[PDB]
Design a protein around this ligand. Sequence first.
Ligand SMILES: *[C@@H]1O[C@H](CO)[C@@H](O[C@@H]2O[C@H](CO)[C@@H](O[C@@H]3O[C@H](CO)[C@@H](O)[C@H](O)[C@@H]3O)[C@H](O)[C@H]2NC(C)=O)[C@H](O)[C@H]1NC(C)=O
Ligand SMILES: *[C@@H]1O[C@H](CO)[C@@H](O[C@@H]2O[C@H](CO)[C@@H](O[C@@H]3O[C@H](CO)[C@@H](O)[C@H](O)[C@@H]3O)[C@H](O)[C@H]2NC(C)=O)[C@H](O)[C@H]1NC(C)=O
Ligand SMILES: *[C@@H]1O[C@H](CO)[C@@H](O[C@@H]2O[C@H](CO)[C@@H](O[C@@H]3O[C@H](CO)[C@@H](O)[C@H](O)[C@@H]3O)[C@H](O)[C@H]2NC(C)=O)[C@H](O)[C@H]1NC(C)=O
Ligand SMILES: *[C@@H]1O[C@H](CO)[C@@H](O[C@@H]2O[C@H](CO)[C@@H](O)[C@H](O)[C@H]2NC(C)=O)[C@H](O)[C@H]1NC(C)=O
Ligand SMILES: *[C@@H]1O[C@H](CO)[C@@H](O[C@@H]2O[C@H](CO)[C@@H](O)[C@H](O)[C@H]2NC(C)=O)[C@H](O)[C@H]1NC(C)=O
Ligand SMILES: *[C@@H]1O[C@H](CO)[C@@H](O[C@@H]2O[C@H](CO)[C@@H](O)[C@H](O)[C@H]2NC(C)=O)[C@H](O)[C@H]1NC(C)=O
Ligand SMILES: *[C@@H]1O[C@H](CO)[C@@H](O[C@@H]2O[C@H](CO)[C@@H](O)[C@H](O)[C@H]2NC(C)=O)[C@H](O)[C@H]1NC(C)=O
Ligand SMILES: *[C@@H]1O[C@H](CO)[C@@H](O)[C@H](O)[C@H]1NC(C)=O
Ligand SMILES: *[C@@H]1O[C@H](CO)[C@@H](O)[C@H](O)[C@H]1NC(C)=O
Lengths: 66, 410, 98, 49, 49, 48
Amino acid sequence: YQDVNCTEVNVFQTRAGCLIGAEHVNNSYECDIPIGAGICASYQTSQSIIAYTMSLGAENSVAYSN
Amino acid sequence: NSIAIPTNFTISVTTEILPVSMTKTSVDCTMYICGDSTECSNLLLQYGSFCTQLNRALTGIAVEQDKNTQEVFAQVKQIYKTPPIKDFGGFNFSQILPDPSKSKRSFIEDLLFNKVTFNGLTVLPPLLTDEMIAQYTSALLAGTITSGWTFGAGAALQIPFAMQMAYRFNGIGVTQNVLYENQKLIANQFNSAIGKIQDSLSSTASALGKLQDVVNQNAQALNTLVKQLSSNFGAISSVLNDILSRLDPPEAEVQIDRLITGRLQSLQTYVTQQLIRAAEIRASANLAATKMSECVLGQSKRVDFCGKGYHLMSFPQSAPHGVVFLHVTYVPAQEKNFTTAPAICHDGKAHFPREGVFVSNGTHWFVTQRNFYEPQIITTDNTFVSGNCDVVIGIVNNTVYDPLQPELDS
Amino acid sequence: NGLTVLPPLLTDEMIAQYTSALLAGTITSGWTFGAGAALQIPFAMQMAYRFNGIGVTQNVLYENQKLIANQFNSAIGKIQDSLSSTASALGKLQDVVN
Amino acid sequence: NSIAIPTNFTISVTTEILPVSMTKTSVDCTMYICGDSTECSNLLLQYGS
Amino acid sequence: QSLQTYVTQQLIRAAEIRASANLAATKMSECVLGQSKRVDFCGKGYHLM
Amino acid sequence: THWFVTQRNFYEPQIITTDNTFVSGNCDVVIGIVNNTVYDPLQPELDS
Ligand SMILES: *[C@@H]1O[C@H](CO)[C@@H](O[C@@H]2O[C@H](CO)[C@@H](O[C@@H]3O[C@H](CO)[C@@H](O)[C@H](O)[C@@H]3O)[C@H](O)[C@H]2NC(C)=O)[C@H](O)[C@H]1NC(C)=O
Ligand SMILES: *[C@@H]1O[C@H](CO)[C@@H](O[C@@H]2O[C@H](CO)[C@@H](O[C@@H]3O[C@H](CO)[C@@H](O)[C@H](O)[C@@H]3O)[C@H](O)[C@H]2NC(C)=O)[C@H](O)[C@H]1NC(C)=O
Ligand SMILES: *[C@@H]1O[C@H](CO)[C@@H](O[C@@H]2O[C@H](CO)[C@@H](O[C@@H]3O[C@H](CO)[C@@H](O)[C@H](O)[C@@H]3O)[C@H](O)[C@H]2NC(C)=O)[C@H](O)[C@H]1NC(C)=O
Ligand SMILES: *[C@@H]1O[C@H](CO)[C@@H](O[C@@H]2O[C@H](CO)[C@@H](O)[C@H](O)[C@H]2NC(C)=O)[C@H](O)[C@H]1NC(C)=O
Ligand SMILES: *[C@@H]1O[C@H](CO)[C@@H](O[C@@H]2O[C@H](CO)[C@@H](O)[C@H](O)[C@H]2NC(C)=O)[C@H](O)[C@H]1NC(C)=O
Ligand SMILES: *[C@@H]1O[C@H](CO)[C@@H](O[C@@H]2O[C@H](CO)[C@@H](O)[C@H](O)[C@H]2NC(C)=O)[C@H](O)[C@H]1NC(C)=O
Ligand SMILES: *[C@@H]1O[C@H](CO)[C@@H](O[C@@H]2O[C@H](CO)[C@@H](O)[C@H](O)[C@H]2NC(C)=O)[C@H](O)[C@H]1NC(C)=O
Ligand SMILES: *[C@@H]1O[C@H](CO)[C@@H](O)[C@H](O)[C@H]1NC(C)=O
Ligand SMILES: *[C@@H]1O[C@H](CO)[C@@H](O)[C@H](O)[C@H]1NC(C)=O
């Protein structure tokens, strides 16, 4: 629900508004289904829709030395 | 016979600012035209698909602002980061690499974000937060700084920055010993040129104007859209509730059909102007995505595409609704006159330079690279032969130095 | 009937002063005037660097510079004839006016 | 086993034409819709912006 | 609607001219001020000037 | 302990030689310079 204030009727408040029916995960993945403000959703393991901040890629310390 | 050749150079840094995305504004034509007013809704639905094709059209614009933001910044395969020791050959990126002490924007990106400024309306959030644009631009920075063009074309192969700039100098036709003999000067020229930007974005407002215009056009398009709710359009009141109090349905439904005709033409105006504006901004997002692939992820041979002067490299800095490129350019300096010739006659053969240009200090003669006077004695190791003194106009008589004959004479 | 036509900022004479400067930059100083200062270079040598940039070695200009002057001069005359005989080339401007 | 290599060249001077600017035509909204009529102008202001 | 039709045609025709002015600005920067190595961008044959 | 020269975009280790190298100035100005021989493809021929 876009911009609504999340006591306005599994249940959660993204920056984009209230997301119902998906679990918020302390993890990140590629942005499978977009939602906005860095939040995305995907279908994962027992299966559910999960919601998370997207990941921009593998972090890589290029092994620079002079 | 007259040529001028630079004795010296200035590395200069220039700022190019490009729009990338509008605000993702969307407007319910139901609540804009009618809104908590079923007597109007029952009238509006008779005009058929118009409100559905407006919601669909502004939704197309909204999704495209995230495609534009994606195609400019999300070019990099991985989130590269720098080692702890900043041993970049004495070049100093302090203003432009991210501050761990803050979003983790860089110093120059903060100065960029510091210099840019309700019924039926909605504003959707962009898909990449400003912090995610700052992580993508840090990946683009640290990729470019540690691995040259290679992260744009495969793996991020590391190289020392003193040698990365030697490839960039070699690429503009300036022989790489010109870098190595001058690397302390060149680091000081680069560093103080980013310093001039760190001043300019703090003291002066004019640079961000090209992003501020994207903001000002949208705020004026929405104020104009909302002020059109107050207009009469020939109905007895512009307030929808006044008609739905003061008049019975047989008159009120004709009065409302004037308002619906008006409030529908204000939306068709705004949505057409936002479709046109989105095409204008998408052409700048495609220009930005191009400049990032060609000038950051590469080195551009394209004249005045990445600033005046020959392009060494460039750095992206995020900005609200846009991108900023710090283009780095060799600009030639301190030219001197010399007599020149296309070729020389030595024992009657015409000798031509392999890559350089022939020049004279009034008396003797030298080859040099064209972009920086570095005279070298005219040997067989820096010339090639074709034909004889007849066929070339203005061929000079001068000695060529054979480099074998001193060795063989021993 | 409420219709009006504003003048362009640059007059067509001032546009001819810009094209004149771009000609003089390109003829006297090669590509250099795009990168900063106009470093002069003789035009026969400028064309040897234009040739060298496309993988034809400098001697192939210098051994043939009389032929290349005549080919170029011929081709410039052909453009005056081609513009003079038919307006159809300017059809991309004329469509915008129409 | 075979390549063709050009034994000569032709310099060509191909011409290309590009449009750059429109005529800067501006039309006044009121003098177009209403001409000099004060009564039409007072009705035109009911359509707002 | 007669005026707003013409303005909407001109906003689209202006963008078709901006797309062409940007191409003419690009061809001047690369092909007058420089020597492009971009095939067919500046005439058939290999570009000299 | 010993050094090679290669093209940049594919590993092909040649010997460091007077055909594939050029000179400018004495050591001290190049920050990070190293010590190695440069083979000469023609200077051994004094004996023959
Ligand atoms: C043009 O460039 C040449 C570079 O070869 C200049 O000639 C060279 O100049 C140096 C000194 O600058 C000469 O060596 C020194 O000459 C003085 C003369 O008093 C002597 O005391 C020293 O023991 C030493 O020999 C060098 O011989 C000379 N080379 C040649 C081939 O002539 C030249 O001066 C420059 N400018 C002009 C106007 O010619
Ligand atoms: C560059 O050096 C060449 C070779 O020394 C110079 O060209 C040659 O100049 C000589 C006289 O200095 C010419 O020989 C004379 O020819 C006349 C007839 O023209 C004859 O009566 C004399 O007995 C004598 O043989 C020679 O023909 C000429 N060769 C050519 C190919 O022109 C040249 O002048 C020098 N140029 C410069 C810019 O220093
Ligand atoms: C390379 O191609 C060019 C054309 O792109 C050739 O240029 C000109 O070609 C004509 C023949 O098609 C030459 O005509 C001959 O000229 C002499 C007098 O110079 C005349 O007596 C003959 O009856 C005949 O018409 C013309 O000379 C030539 N232009 C120049 C300035 O050379 C060129 O011939 C080609 N290169 C070679 C090696 O043939
Ligand atoms: C890189 O540039 C920064 C400035 O952007 C330099 O940092 C300054 O260094 C002096 C001397 O250590 C300090 O007194 C200043 O407080 C520093 N900050 C500023 C904003 O001036 C830094 O020294 C440069 N060199 C390196 C290798 O980092
Ligand atoms: C080339 O230009 C640089 C500056 O861009 C010159 O370096 C300056 O040299 C003077 C003394 O001649 C010093 O006072 C300055 O401190 C130097 N500036 C910098 C930024 O280091 C250099 O001398 C010039 N000359 C040549 C032949 O390269
Ligand atoms: C450069 O141009 C000059 C003309 O400006 C050419 O002609 C010679 O010019 C010198 C004086 O600069 C005179 O002493 C000669 O007598 C002129 N030649 C003739 C045939 O009279 C000159 O040949 C040109 N040089 C080059 C290198 O192209
Ligand atoms: C390369 O090796 C030479 C010796 O073969 C080094 O030169 C000596 O360096 C010491 C440094 O304290 C001086 O005391 C000597 O006088 C130098 N001898 C000569 C002949 O110059 C040189 O420093 C080495 N270079 C590098 C970059 O390692
Ligand atoms: C509603 O939104 C505001 C911020 O816009 C926030 O302060 C408030 O806590 C929200 N309401 C609830 C129930 O959290
Ligand atoms: C490379 O790193 C080492 C670290 O001790 C340093 O001594 C050396 O001067 C550096 N070389 C260059 C060319 O930066």
